[PDB]
Amino acid sequence: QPVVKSLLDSKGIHYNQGNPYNLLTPVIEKVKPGEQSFVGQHAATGSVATATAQIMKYHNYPNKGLKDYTYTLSSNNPYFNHPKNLFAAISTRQYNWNNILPTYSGRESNVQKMAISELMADVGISVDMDYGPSSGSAGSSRVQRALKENFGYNQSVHQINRGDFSKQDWEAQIDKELSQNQPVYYQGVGKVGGHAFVIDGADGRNFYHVNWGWGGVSDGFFRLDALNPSALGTGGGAGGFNGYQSAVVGIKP
């Protein structure tokens, strides 16, 4: 296995889901029974969204959105009535990759914050992101689909299922992407949805550079036997976080 440095790091790409990244997510209007009130709360972008958007930042491909998108909020979302239609004017987006900073500290101006915030909203949207205080999306099917549909990434964008591949041929799909310094959108699905993160490097030992969807927890190498989030406690489907493990590889124009 060849060694690969962190592509996201080589681009000072450090994203989040609540910081100025969720400054454009849809606002919550209802409360979940068995939880606190989240109305008026800026929903999150979603790991899946942030995993893709980071790779979207790594390539800053569409300077303008490629195609308008549209999805109806999930009937499981306890944050809005339900027949809620979300719409991203992506086809009419202005992706200023110079304002969509690769790393936000939450103290930058609003202009650059508006940049990444819309990307996450466009991405989280393009991936039917569930928008609540926590944002759960589907993952690859959404990313690999939105990646080429709304952002038009090279057709090389596709989805693979770790559950259906052999660890060896599975890491091959990743390193191959890393061989060309091309990060991978990865995600281990379970009950809450597909938890995603970005692979942007390798250490020569079946280990890749991963950008979990959290702040600074297990950020560093990827996992081969435990593809779960170190900081559990997301939605209400905790427990067993490997129902559908898959990866989106080949994210580039």
Coordinates of N, CA and C in Angstrom, one line a residue:
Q1 N 0.9 -1.2 0.0 CA 0.0 0.0 0.0 C 0.9 1.3 0.0
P2 N 0.6 2.2 -0.9 CA 1.4 3.4 -1.0 C 0.9 4.4 0.0
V3 N 1.8 5.3 0.5 CA 1.5 6.2 1.5 C 0.9 7.5 0.9
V4 N -0.1 8.1 1.5 CA -0.7 9.3 0.9 C -0.9 10.4 2.0
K5 N -0.5 11.6 1.7 CA -0.7 12.7 2.8 C -2.2 13.0 2.8
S6 N -2.6 13.8 3.7 CA -4.0 14.2 3.8 C -4.4 15.3 2.8
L7 N -5.2 14.9 1.8 CA -5.6 15.8 0.7 C -6.4 17.0 1.4
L8 N -7.3 16.7 2.2 CA -8.1 17.8 2.9 C -7.1 18.7 3.6
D9 N -6.1 18.1 4.2 CA -5.1 18.9 5.0 C -4.3 19.7 4.0
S10 N -3.9 19.0 2.9 CA -3.0 19.8 1.9 C -3.8 21.0 1.4
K11 N -5.1 21.0 1.6 CA -5.9 22.2 1.2 C -6.4 22.9 2.5
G12 N -5.8 22.7 3.6 CA -6.3 23.4 4.8 C -7.8 23.2 4.9
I13 N -8.3 22.1 4.5 CA -9.8 21.9 4.5 C -10.2 21.3 5.8
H14 N -10.9 22.1 6.6 CA -11.4 21.7 7.9 C -12.8 22.2 8.0
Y15 N -13.8 21.3 7.8 CA -15.2 21.7 7.8 C -15.9 21.3 9.1
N16 N -17.1 21.7 9.2 CA -17.9 21.3 10.4 C -19.4 21.2 10.0
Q17 N -20.3 21.0 10.9 CA -21.7 20.9 10.5 C -22.6 21.9 11.2
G18 N -22.0 22.6 12.2 CA -22.8 23.6 13.0 C -22.2 25.0 12.8
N19 N -20.8 25.1 12.8 CA -20.1 26.4 12.7 C -20.7 27.3 11.6
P20 N -20.0 28.0 10.8 CA -20.7 28.8 9.8 C -21.2 27.9 8.7
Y21 N -21.0 26.7 8.8 CA -21.5 25.7 7.8 C -23.0 25.6 7.9
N22 N -23.6 25.6 9.1 CA -25.0 25.5 9.2 C -25.7 26.9 9.2
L23 N -25.0 27.9 8.8 CA -25.6 29.2 8.8 C -26.6 29.4 7.7
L24 N -26.9 28.3 7.0 CA -27.9 28.5 5.9 C -28.8 27.3 5.9
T25 N -28.6 26.3 6.8 CA -29.5 25.1 6.8 C -31.0 25.7 7.1
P26 N -32.0 24.9 6.8 CA -33.3 25.3 7.1 C -33.6 25.3 8.6
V27 N -34.3 26.3 9.0 CA -34.6 26.5 10.5 C -35.7 25.5 10.9
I28 N -35.5 25.0 12.1 CA -36.4 24.0 12.7 C -37.7 24.7 13.1
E29 N -38.8 24.0 13.0 CA -40.1 24.6 13.4 C -40.9 23.8 14.4
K30 N -40.6 22.5 14.5 CA -41.3 21.7 15.5 C -40.4 21.0 16.5
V31 N -40.9 20.4 17.5 CA -40.0 19.8 18.5 C -40.2 18.2 18.5
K32 N -39.1 17.6 18.8 CA -39.2 16.1 18.9 C -39.6 15.6 20.3
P33 N -40.6 14.8 20.3 CA -41.1 14.3 21.6 C -40.0 13.4 22.3
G34 N -39.6 13.8 23.5 CA -38.5 13.0 24.2 C -37.2 13.8 24.0
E35 N -37.3 15.0 23.6 CA -36.0 15.8 23.4 C -36.3 17.3 23.8
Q36 N -35.4 18.2 23.6 CA -35.6 19.6 23.9 C -36.2 20.3 22.7
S37 N -36.6 21.5 22.8 CA -37.2 22.2 21.7 C -36.1 22.7 20.7
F38 N -36.3 22.6 19.4 CA -35.2 23.0 18.5 C -35.8 24.0 17.5
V39 N -37.0 24.6 17.8 CA -37.6 25.5 16.8 C -36.7 26.8 16.7
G40 N -36.5 27.3 15.5 CA -35.7 28.6 15.4 C -34.2 28.2 15.4
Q41 N -33.9 26.9 15.6 CA -32.5 26.4 15.6 C -32.0 26.2 14.2
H42 N -30.8 26.7 13.9 CA -30.3 26.5 12.5 C -29.9 25.0 12.4
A43 N -30.7 24.3 11.7 CA -30.4 22.8 11.5 C -29.0 22.6 11.2
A44 N -28.5 21.4 11.2 CA -27.1 21.1 10.9 C -26.9 20.8 9.4
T45 N -25.7 20.7 8.9 CA -25.5 20.4 7.5 C -25.6 18.8 7.3
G46 N -25.1 18.1 8.3 CA -25.2 16.6 8.2 C -23.8 16.1 7.8
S47 N -23.4 15.0 8.5 CA -22.0 14.5 8.2 C -22.0 14.2 6.7
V48 N -22.9 13.4 6.2 CA -22.9 13.1 4.7 C -22.7 14.4 4.0
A49 N -23.4 15.4 4.2 CA -23.3 16.7 3.5 C -21.8 17.2 3.7
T50 N -21.4 17.3 4.9 CA -20.1 17.9 5.2 C -19.0 17.0 4.6
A51 N -19.3 15.7 4.6 CA -18.2 14.8 4.0 C -18.1 15.1 2.6
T52 N -19.2 15.3 1.9 CA -19.2 15.6 0.5 C -18.7 17.0 0.2
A53 N -19.3 18.0 0.9 CA -19.0 19.4 0.7 C -17.5 19.6 0.9
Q54 N -16.9 18.9 1.9 CA -15.4 19.1 2.1 C -14.7 18.7 0.8
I55 N -15.1 17.5 0.3 CA -14.5 17.1 -1.0 C -15.0 18.0 -2.1
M56 N -16.1 18.7 -1.9 CA -16.6 19.6 -2.9 C -15.6 20.8 -2.8
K57 N -15.2 21.1 -1.6 CA -14.2 22.3 -1.4 C -12.9 21.8 -1.9
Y58 N -12.5 20.6 -1.6 CA -11.2 20.1 -2.1 C -11.1 20.3 -3.6
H59 N -12.2 20.2 -4.3 CA -12.1 20.4 -5.8 C -12.7 21.7 -6.2
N60 N -13.6 22.3 -5.4 CA -14.2 23.6 -5.7 C -14.6 23.5 -7.2
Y61 N -15.3 22.5 -7.6 CA -15.6 22.2 -9.0 C -16.6 23.2 -9.6
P62 N -17.9 23.1 -9.2 CA -18.9 24.0 -9.8 C -18.7 25.5 -9.3
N63 N -18.3 26.3 -10.1 CA -18.2 27.8 -9.7 C -19.6 28.2 -9.6
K64 N -20.5 27.6 -10.3 CA -22.0 27.9 -10.3 C -22.7 26.5 -10.2
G65 N -23.8 26.5 -9.6 CA -24.5 25.2 -9.4 C -24.8 24.6 -10.8
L66 N -24.8 23.3 -10.8 CA -25.0 22.6 -12.1 C -26.5 22.3 -12.4
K67 N -27.3 22.0 -11.3 CA -28.7 21.7 -11.6 C -29.6 22.0 -10.4
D68 N -30.7 22.6 -10.6 CA -31.6 22.9 -9.4 C -31.9 21.5 -8.8
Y69 N -32.2 21.5 -7.5 CA -32.5 20.2 -6.9 C -33.9 20.3 -6.2
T70 N -34.4 19.2 -5.7 CA -35.7 19.4 -4.8 C -36.0 18.0 -4.1
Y71 N -36.3 18.1 -2.8 CA -36.6 16.9 -2.0 C -37.6 17.2 -0.9
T72 N -38.5 16.3 -0.6 CA -39.5 16.6 0.4 C -39.0 16.1 1.8
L73 N -39.1 16.8 2.8 CA -38.6 16.4 4.1 C -39.1 15.0 4.5
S74 N -38.2 14.2 5.1 CA -38.6 12.9 5.6 C -39.8 12.9 6.5
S75 N -40.7 11.9 6.5 CA -41.9 11.9 7.4 C -41.4 11.6 8.8
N76 N -40.1 11.3 9.0 CA -39.6 11.0 10.3 C -39.0 12.2 11.0
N77 N -38.9 13.3 10.3 CA -38.4 14.6 10.8 C -39.4 15.2 11.8
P78 N -39.1 15.2 13.0 CA -39.9 15.7 14.1 C -39.6 17.2 14.3
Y79 N -39.0 17.8 13.3 CA -38.6 19.3 13.4 C -39.5 20.1 12.5
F80 N -40.2 19.6 11.6 CA -41.1 20.4 10.7 C -42.5 19.7 10.6
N81 N -43.5 20.3 10.1 CA -44.8 19.6 9.9 C -44.4 18.2 9.2
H82 N -44.3 18.3 7.9 CA -43.9 17.0 7.2 C -43.9 17.2 5.7
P83 N -45.0 17.7 5.2 CA -45.0 18.0 3.8 C -44.2 19.3 3.5
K84 N -43.0 19.2 3.8 CA -42.1 20.3 3.7 C -41.2 20.1 2.5
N85 N -41.2 21.0 1.5 CA -40.4 20.8 0.3 C -39.2 21.7 0.4
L86 N -38.0 21.1 0.4 CA -36.8 21.9 0.4 C -36.3 22.2 -1.0
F87 N -35.8 23.3 -1.3 CA -35.3 23.6 -2.7 C -34.0 24.4 -2.7
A88 N -33.1 23.9 -3.5 CA -31.7 24.6 -3.6 C -31.6 25.2 -4.9
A89 N -31.5 26.5 -5.0 CA -31.4 27.1 -6.4 C -29.9 26.9 -6.9
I90 N -29.5 25.7 -6.7 CA -28.1 25.4 -7.2 C -27.9 25.8 -8.6
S91 N -28.7 25.3 -9.5 CA -28.5 25.8 -10.9 C -28.2 27.3 -11.0
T92 N -28.7 28.0 -10.0 CA -28.5 29.5 -10.0 C -27.6 29.8 -8.8
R93 N -26.7 29.0 -8.5 CA -25.8 29.2 -7.3 C -24.5 29.9 -7.8
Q94 N -23.9 30.6 -6.9 CA -22.6 31.3 -7.2 C -21.6 30.7 -6.3
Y95 N -20.9 29.7 -6.7 CA -19.9 29.0 -5.9 C -18.6 29.8 -5.9
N96 N -18.4 30.8 -5.1 CA -17.2 31.5 -5.1 C -16.2 30.7 -4.3
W97 N -15.5 29.8 -4.9 CA -14.5 28.9 -4.2 C -13.4 29.8 -3.5
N98 N -13.4 31.0 -3.7 CA -12.4 31.9 -3.0 C -13.1 32.4 -1.7
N99 N -14.4 32.3 -1.6 CA -15.1 32.7 -0.3 C -15.4 31.4 0.5
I100 N -15.6 30.3 -0.2 CA -15.9 29.0 0.5 C -14.6 28.5 1.1
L101 N -14.1 29.2 2.1 CA -12.8 28.8 2.7 C -12.9 27.3 3.1
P102 N -11.7 26.7 3.0 CA -11.6 25.3 3.3 C -11.6 25.1 4.9
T103 N -11.4 26.1 5.6 CA -11.4 25.9 7.1 C -12.0 27.1 7.7
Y104 N -13.1 27.0 8.5 CA -13.7 28.2 9.1 C -13.5 28.1 10.6
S105 N -13.2 29.3 11.2 CA -13.0 29.3 12.7 C -14.2 29.9 13.4
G106 N -15.2 30.2 12.6 CA -16.5 30.8 13.2 C -16.3 32.3 13.4
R107 N -15.2 32.8 13.1 CA -14.9 34.3 13.4 C -14.7 35.0 12.1
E108 N -14.8 34.3 11.0 CA -14.6 34.9 9.6 C -15.8 35.9 9.3
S109 N -15.7 36.7 8.3 CA -16.8 37.6 8.0 C -18.0 36.7 7.5
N110 N -19.1 37.4 7.3 CA -20.4 36.6 6.9 C -20.3 36.2 5.4
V111 N -19.7 37.1 4.6 CA -19.6 36.8 3.2 C -19.0 35.4 3.0
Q112 N -17.8 35.2 3.5 CA -17.1 33.8 3.4 C -18.0 32.8 4.1
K113 N -18.6 33.2 5.2 CA -19.5 32.2 5.9 C -20.7 31.9 5.1
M114 N -21.2 32.8 4.4 CA -22.4 32.6 3.5 C -22.0 31.6 2.4
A115 N -20.7 31.7 2.0 CA -20.2 30.8 0.9 C -20.3 29.4 1.3
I116 N -19.6 29.0 2.3 CA -19.6 27.5 2.7 C -21.0 27.2 3.2
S117 N -21.7 28.0 4.0 CA -23.0 27.7 4.5 C -24.0 27.3 3.4
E118 N -23.9 28.0 2.3 CA -24.8 27.7 1.1 C -24.3 26.4 0.5
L119 N -23.0 26.2 0.4 CA -22.5 24.9 -0.2 C -23.1 23.8 0.7
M120 N -22.9 23.8 1.9 CA -23.5 22.8 2.8 C -25.0 22.7 2.6
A121 N -25.7 23.8 2.5 CA -27.1 23.7 2.3 C -27.4 23.2 0.9
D122 N -26.6 23.5 0.0 CA -26.8 23.0 -1.4 C -26.4 21.5 -1.3
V123 N -25.3 21.2 -0.7 CA -24.9 19.7 -0.6 C -25.9 19.0 0.3
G124 N -26.0 19.4 1.5 CA -27.0 18.7 2.4 C -28.3 18.6 1.7
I125 N -28.7 19.6 1.0 CA -30.0 19.5 0.2 C -29.8 18.5 -0.9
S126 N -28.9 18.7 -1.7 CA -28.7 17.8 -2.9 C -28.7 16.4 -2.4
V127 N -28.3 16.1 -1.1 CA -28.3 14.7 -0.6 C -29.5 14.5 0.3
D128 N -30.6 15.1 0.0 CA -31.8 14.9 0.8 C -31.4 14.9 2.3
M129 N -30.5 15.8 2.7 CA -30.1 15.8 4.1 C -31.3 16.0 5.1
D130 N -31.3 15.3 6.1 CA -32.4 15.5 7.1 C -32.0 16.7 8.0
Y131 N -32.8 17.7 8.0 CA -32.4 18.9 8.7 C -33.0 19.1 10.1
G132 N -32.3 18.9 11.1 CA -32.7 19.1 12.5 C -31.5 19.7 13.2
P133 N -31.5 19.7 14.5 CA -30.3 20.2 15.2 C -29.2 19.3 14.8
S134 N -29.5 18.0 14.6 CA -28.6 17.0 14.1 C -29.0 16.8 12.6
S135 N -28.1 16.7 11.7 CA -28.6 16.5 10.3 C -28.2 15.1 9.8
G136 N -29.1 14.2 9.5 CA -28.8 12.9 9.0 C -29.2 12.7 7.6
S137 N -28.4 12.3 6.7 CA -28.7 12.1 5.3 C -28.7 10.6 4.9
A138 N -28.7 10.3 3.7 CA -28.7 8.9 3.3 C -27.2 8.6 3.1
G139 N -26.5 9.4 2.3 CA -25.1 9.2 2.1 C -24.7 9.0 0.7
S140 N -24.0 8.0 0.4 CA -23.5 7.7 -1.0 C -24.6 7.9 -2.1
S141 N -25.6 7.1 -2.0 CA -26.7 7.2 -3.0 C -27.1 8.7 -3.2
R142 N -27.0 9.4 -2.1 CA -27.3 10.9 -2.2 C -26.1 11.6 -2.7
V143 N -24.9 11.3 -2.2 CA -23.7 12.0 -2.6 C -23.3 11.6 -4.0
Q144 N -23.1 10.3 -4.2 CA -22.7 9.9 -5.6 C -23.8 10.4 -6.6
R145 N -25.0 10.5 -6.2 CA -26.1 11.0 -7.1 C -26.0 12.5 -7.2
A146 N -26.0 13.2 -6.0 CA -25.9 14.7 -6.0 C -24.6 15.1 -6.6
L147 N -23.5 14.4 -6.3 CA -22.2 14.8 -6.8 C -22.3 15.0 -8.3
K148 N -22.8 14.0 -9.0 CA -22.9 14.2 -10.5 C -24.2 14.9 -10.9
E149 N -25.2 14.8 -10.2 CA -26.5 15.5 -10.6 C -26.5 17.0 -10.4
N150 N -26.4 17.5 -9.2 CA -26.4 18.9 -8.9 C -25.0 19.6 -9.1
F151 N -24.0 18.9 -8.8 CA -22.6 19.5 -9.0 C -21.9 19.0 -10.2
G152 N -22.5 18.0 -10.9 CA -21.9 17.5 -12.1 C -20.4 17.0 -12.0
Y153 N -20.1 16.4 -10.9 CA -18.7 15.9 -10.8 C -18.4 14.9 -11.9
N154 N -17.2 14.7 -12.2 CA -16.9 13.7 -13.3 C -17.8 12.4 -13.1
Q155 N -18.2 11.8 -14.2 CA -19.0 10.6 -14.1 C -18.3 9.6 -13.2
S156 N -17.0 9.7 -13.0 CA -16.3 8.8 -12.2 C -16.9 8.7 -10.8
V157 N -17.8 9.6 -10.5 CA -18.5 9.6 -9.1 C -19.4 8.4 -9.0
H158 N -19.2 7.5 -8.1 CA -20.1 6.3 -8.0 C -20.2 5.9 -6.5
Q159 N -21.0 4.9 -6.2 CA -21.1 4.4 -4.8 C -20.7 3.0 -4.7
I160 N -20.0 2.6 -3.6 CA -19.6 1.2 -3.4 C -20.1 0.7 -2.1
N161 N -20.3 -0.5 -1.9 CA -20.8 -1.0 -0.6 C -19.8 -1.9 0.2
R162 N -19.1 -1.3 1.1 CA -18.1 -2.0 1.9 C -18.7 -3.4 2.3
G163 N -20.0 -3.4 2.6 CA -20.6 -4.7 3.0 C -20.6 -5.7 1.9
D164 N -20.5 -5.3 0.7 CA -20.5 -6.2 -0.5 C -19.1 -6.4 -1.1
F165 N -18.1 -5.8 -0.5 CA -16.7 -5.9 -1.1 C -15.8 -6.6 0.0
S166 N -14.7 -7.1 -0.5 CA -13.7 -7.7 0.4 C -12.7 -6.6 0.9
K167 N -12.5 -6.5 2.2 CA -11.6 -5.5 2.8 C -10.5 -5.1 1.8
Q168 N -9.9 -6.1 1.2 CA -8.8 -5.8 0.3 C -9.3 -5.0 -0.9
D169 N -10.1 -5.6 -1.7 CA -10.7 -4.9 -2.9 C -11.4 -3.6 -2.4
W170 N -11.8 -3.6 -1.2 CA -12.5 -2.4 -0.7 C -11.6 -1.2 -0.5
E171 N -10.5 -1.5 0.1 CA -9.5 -0.4 0.3 C -8.9 -0.1 -1.0
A172 N -8.9 -1.0 -2.0 CA -8.4 -0.7 -3.3 C -9.2 0.4 -3.9
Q173 N -10.5 0.4 -3.8 CA -11.3 1.5 -4.4 C -10.9 2.8 -3.7
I174 N -10.5 2.8 -2.5 CA -10.1 4.1 -1.8 C -8.7 4.5 -2.3
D175 N -7.7 3.7 -1.9 CA -6.3 4.1 -2.3 C -6.3 4.5 -3.8
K176 N -7.0 3.7 -4.6 CA -7.0 4.1 -6.1 C -7.3 5.6 -6.1
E177 N -8.4 6.0 -5.4 CA -8.8 7.4 -5.4 C -7.6 8.2 -4.8
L178 N -7.1 7.8 -3.8 CA -6.0 8.5 -3.1 C -4.7 8.5 -4.0
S179 N -4.5 7.4 -4.8 CA -3.3 7.4 -5.7 C -3.2 8.7 -6.5
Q180 N -4.4 9.2 -6.9 CA -4.4 10.4 -7.7 C -4.7 11.6 -6.7
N181 N -4.4 11.5 -5.5 CA -4.7 12.6 -4.5 C -6.2 12.9 -4.7
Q182 N -7.0 11.9 -4.6 CA -8.5 12.2 -4.8 C -9.1 11.5 -3.6
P183 N -9.7 12.4 -2.7 CA -10.3 11.9 -1.5 C -11.6 11.1 -1.8
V184 N -12.0 10.4 -0.8 CA -13.2 9.6 -0.9 C -14.3 9.9 0.0
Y185 N -15.5 10.0 -0.4 CA -16.6 10.3 0.5 C -17.0 8.9 1.1
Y186 N -16.8 8.7 2.3 CA -17.1 7.4 2.9 C -18.2 7.5 3.9
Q187 N -18.9 6.4 4.2 CA -19.9 6.5 5.3 C -20.4 5.1 5.7
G188 N -20.5 4.9 6.9 CA -21.0 3.6 7.4 C -22.5 3.8 7.8
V189 N -23.4 3.3 7.1 CA -24.8 3.5 7.5 C -25.3 2.6 8.6
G190 N -26.4 2.9 9.2 CA -26.9 2.2 10.3 C -28.4 2.5 10.5
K191 N -28.8 2.9 11.6 CA -30.3 3.3 11.8 C -30.5 4.8 11.5
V192 N -29.7 5.7 12.2 CA -29.9 7.1 11.9 C -29.6 7.5 10.5
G193 N -28.9 6.7 9.8 CA -28.6 7.1 8.3 C -27.1 6.8 8.0
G194 N -26.7 7.3 6.9 CA -25.2 7.0 6.5 C -24.3 8.0 7.2
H195 N -23.5 7.6 8.2 CA -22.6 8.5 8.8 C -21.4 8.7 7.8
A196 N -21.1 9.9 7.4 CA -20.0 10.0 6.4 C -18.7 10.7 6.9
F197 N -17.7 10.5 6.2 CA -16.4 11.2 6.5 C -15.5 11.2 5.2
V198 N -14.4 11.9 5.2 CA -13.7 12.0 3.9 C -12.3 11.3 4.1
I199 N -11.9 10.5 3.1 CA -10.6 9.9 3.1 C -9.7 10.8 2.2
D200 N -8.6 11.2 2.7 CA -7.7 12.0 1.9 C -6.3 11.7 2.1
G201 N -5.9 10.4 2.3 CA -4.5 10.1 2.4 C -4.3 8.6 2.9
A202 N -3.1 8.2 3.1 CA -2.9 6.8 3.5 C -1.5 6.7 4.2
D203 N -1.3 5.7 5.0 CA 0.0 5.6 5.7 C 0.8 4.4 5.3
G204 N 0.4 3.7 4.3 CA 1.1 2.5 3.8 C 0.6 1.3 4.6
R205 N -0.3 1.4 5.5 CA -0.8 0.2 6.2 C -2.4 0.2 6.2
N206 N -2.9 -0.1 5.1 CA -4.4 -0.1 5.0 C -5.1 1.0 5.8
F207 N -4.4 2.1 6.0 CA -4.9 3.2 6.8 C -5.0 4.4 6.0
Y208 N -6.1 5.0 5.9 CA -6.3 6.3 5.1 C -6.4 7.5 6.0
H209 N -6.4 8.7 5.4 CA -6.5 9.9 6.2 C -8.0 10.2 6.2
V210 N -8.6 10.2 7.4 CA -10.1 10.4 7.4 C -10.5 11.7 8.1
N211 N -11.5 12.3 7.6 CA -12.0 13.6 8.2 C -13.4 13.3 8.7
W212 N -13.5 12.7 9.9 CA -14.8 12.4 10.5 C -15.7 13.6 10.4
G213 N -17.0 13.4 10.7 CA -17.9 14.5 10.6 C -18.0 15.2 12.0
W214 N -16.9 15.1 12.8 CA -16.9 15.7 14.1 C -15.8 16.8 14.2
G215 N -15.6 17.3 15.4 CA -14.5 18.3 15.5 C -13.1 17.7 15.5
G216 N -12.6 17.4 16.6 CA -11.2 16.7 16.6 C -11.3 15.5 17.5
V217 N -12.0 14.5 17.1 CA -12.1 13.3 17.9 C -11.2 12.2 17.4
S218 N -11.6 11.3 16.7 CA -10.7 10.2 16.1 C -10.2 10.7 14.7
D219 N -10.3 11.9 14.4 CA -9.8 12.4 13.1 C -8.4 12.0 12.9
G220 N -8.1 11.3 11.8 CA -6.7 10.8 11.6 C -6.7 9.7 10.6
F221 N -6.7 8.5 11.1 CA -6.8 7.3 10.3 C -8.2 6.7 10.2
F222 N -8.4 5.9 9.2 CA -9.8 5.3 9.0 C -9.9 4.0 9.8
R223 N -11.0 3.3 9.8 CA -11.1 2.1 10.5 C -11.5 0.9 9.6
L224 N -11.1 -0.3 9.9 CA -11.4 -1.4 8.9 C -12.3 -2.4 9.6
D225 N -12.4 -2.4 10.9 CA -13.3 -3.3 11.6 C -14.3 -2.5 12.4
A226 N -14.0 -1.3 12.8 CA -15.0 -0.5 13.5 C -15.2 0.8 12.8
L227 N -16.1 0.8 11.8 CA -16.5 2.0 11.0 C -17.6 2.8 11.7
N228 N -17.5 3.0 13.0 CA -18.5 3.8 13.7 C -18.0 5.1 14.2
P229 N -18.8 6.0 14.5 CA -18.4 7.4 15.0 C -18.0 7.3 16.5
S230 N -16.9 7.8 16.8 CA -16.4 7.8 18.2 C -17.4 8.5 19.1
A231 N -17.9 9.6 18.7 CA -18.9 10.3 19.5 C -20.3 9.9 19.1
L232 N -20.8 8.9 19.7 CA -22.2 8.4 19.3 C -23.2 9.4 19.9
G233 N -24.5 9.0 19.8 CA -25.5 9.9 20.3 C -25.9 11.0 19.3
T234 N -26.5 10.5 18.2 CA -26.9 11.4 17.1 C -28.4 11.6 17.1
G235 N -29.1 10.7 16.4 CA -30.6 10.8 16.3 C -31.2 9.9 17.4
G236 N -32.0 9.0 16.9 CA -32.7 8.0 17.9 C -32.5 6.6 17.4
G237 N -31.5 6.4 16.5 CA -31.3 5.1 16.0 C -29.9 4.6 16.4
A238 N -29.4 5.1 17.5 CA -28.0 4.7 18.0 C -28.0 3.2 18.0
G239 N -26.8 2.6 18.2 CA -26.7 1.2 18.3 C -26.5 0.6 16.9
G240 N -25.7 -0.4 16.7 CA -25.5 -1.0 15.3 C -25.4 0.2 14.3
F241 N -24.2 0.6 14.0 CA -24.1 1.7 13.0 C -23.5 1.2 11.7
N242 N -23.8 0.0 11.4 CA -23.2 -0.6 10.1 C -24.3 -1.4 9.4
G243 N -25.4 -0.8 9.1 CA -26.5 -1.5 8.3 C -26.2 -1.4 6.8
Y244 N -25.7 -0.3 6.4 CA -25.3 -0.2 4.9 C -24.0 0.6 4.8
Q245 N -22.9 -0.1 4.7 CA -21.6 0.5 4.6 C -21.3 0.7 3.2
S246 N -21.0 1.9 2.7 CA -20.7 2.1 1.3 C -19.7 3.3 1.1
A247 N -19.2 3.5 0.0 CA -18.2 4.6 -0.3 C -18.5 5.3 -1.6
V248 N -18.3 6.6 -1.7 CA -18.4 7.3 -2.9 C -17.0 7.6 -3.3
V249 N -16.6 7.1 -4.5 CA -15.2 7.3 -4.9 C -15.1 8.0 -6.3
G250 N -14.1 8.8 -6.5 CA -14.0 9.5 -7.8 C -14.7 10.8 -7.8
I251 N -14.5 11.6 -6.9 CA -15.2 12.9 -6.8 C -14.3 14.0 -7.4
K252 N -14.4 14.2 -8.7 CA -13.6 15.3 -9.3 C -14.2 15.6 -10.7
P253 N -14.0 16.8 -11.1 CA -14.6 17.3 -12.4 C -13.7 16.8 -13.6

